[PDB]
């Protein structure tokens, strides 16, 4: 109760712990047959990797991002949130 | 009544993880539908004068 808090949306660091756990999700699930990633150090070279590529089902399930030991996650419950600035309704979770 | 959308299916895609094209298998045979909810938009302005 009575906690106001300057939240932020564009400088979060749960986002980077999602973008590198979905990159790691699509590397064990969608294995392409031919993959032309560049690898160079003006003129550059492009590599080509090849893995065993079968077809598998792919339906995304909900993923909860829990907090480790020693921290807690706030929750901006203001139902008209601008995304940034102060958020007057704040709960822990 | 409803609007149609002339979609496609690709096999040579630019993946979003890094830079560099992927290349995938031929598509599956039968019917593959997917019902989903468009709960969002990502627009972008164009500020002239």
């Amino acid at each position, epitope marked *: 109760e009575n906690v106001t808090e300057e939240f932020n949306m564009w400088k979060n660091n749960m986002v980077e712990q999602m973008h590198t756990d979905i990159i790691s999700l699509w590397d064990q699930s969608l294995k392409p047959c*031919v993959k032309l990633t560049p690898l160079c150090v003006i003129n550059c070279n492009t590599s080509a990797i*090849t893995q065993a590529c079968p077809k598998v089902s792919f339906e995304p399930i909900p993923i909860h991002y829990c907090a480790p030991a020693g921290f807690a996650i706030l929750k901006c419950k203001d139902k008209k949130f601008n995304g940034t600035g102060p958020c007057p309704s704040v709960s822990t979770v | 009544d409803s609007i149609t959308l002339p979609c496609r299916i690709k096999q040579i895609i630019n993946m979003w993880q890094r830079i560099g*094209q992927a290349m995938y298998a031929p598509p599956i045979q039968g019917v593959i539908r997917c019902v989903s909810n468009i709960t969002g938009l990502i627009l972008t302005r164009d500020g002239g004068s």
Partner: antibody
Amino acid sequence: VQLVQSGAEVNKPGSSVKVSCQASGATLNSHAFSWVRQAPGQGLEWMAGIIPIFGSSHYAQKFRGRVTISADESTRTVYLHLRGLRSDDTAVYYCASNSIAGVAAAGDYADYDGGYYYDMDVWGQGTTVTVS
Amino acid sequence: QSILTQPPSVSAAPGQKVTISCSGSSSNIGNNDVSWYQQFPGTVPKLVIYENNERPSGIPDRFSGSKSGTSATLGITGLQTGDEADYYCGTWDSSLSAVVFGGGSKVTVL
């Protein structure tokens, strides 16, 4: 990269042939196999050929109908079957693939019924066939 | 049969310059990539020049060529005994809807 075949075989007019060409990589989909012959005394002739990444298959003008060609997905091999074995077919059979990775650098959508057989590199050891 | 009109056999002195002039139509040279293959009689054939000017690993730079309109040439410098092989002219032709090889050109040295 290795590309091995089966051994030499003898045939009879009216029978068929089951010659294989088994790969060395992880799968077949990164390579575009072909099937060329070499009649003795003359050059070579492109008989058939398969591209598994698009599911297509291509043939010459003459060898349509007599030749069916199937690439087995599991053990990384491609077969070559032929019926109507006449005495002109007494030759050595060669399987040769190349890299399919150049089709991706084409702009947007490509020809998926078309053919990209060029610059074969991994020519197999050659299976000599004869009919009697 | 040679849809690409390749010469049957050429001959020159060892170390000199000889050019195989494989010509074709406008449906296999001007709008298709050509390639060449080298096979000693009794050996497995192998390419020597691809993409009209390129040499793979294991191929000397003495082999070259061109793709001029409806014709495709070979710049073959430095002839020795160990190039006693038949050279072919293979490319895709969409009009026949198949790959077509040339007539084969056998070089020989003294």
